[PDB]
């Protein structure tokens, strides 16, 4: 089926998982994560295999798959 689940790991090793489509712009994940952490989205950088995830990157563009990890670091 079409949602994949991505694991977002915080600096404190906490995890929030997100269900997204392959075509979803990951800005929406970044905004949801920042909201739930209580911090401004622009205070964070989101990385996939160490590379910065842009607002308009999609899982398809980045080659993401079910249960791939995103790491969040301070900007």
């Amino acid at each position: 089926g079409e949602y994949i689940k991505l694991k977002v790991i915080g600096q404190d090793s906490s995890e929030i998982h997100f269900k997204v489509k392959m075509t979803t712009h990951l800005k929406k994940l970044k905004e949801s994560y920042a909201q739930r952490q209580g911090v401004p989205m622009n205070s964070l950088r989101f990385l996939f295999e160490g590379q910065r995830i842009a607002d308009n990157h999609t899982p398809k563009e980045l080659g993401m798959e079910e249960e791939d990890v995103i790491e969040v670091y301070q900007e």
Binding site: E15, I16, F18, K19, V20, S32
Partner: peptide
């Protein structure tokens, strides 16, 4: 911590404001 899964949602004539 418990598992947390968030579903990200997709990307007028009823309006009054």
């Amino acid at each position: 911590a418990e598992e947390r899964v968030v579903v990200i949602s997709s990307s007028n004539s009823s309006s009054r404001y």
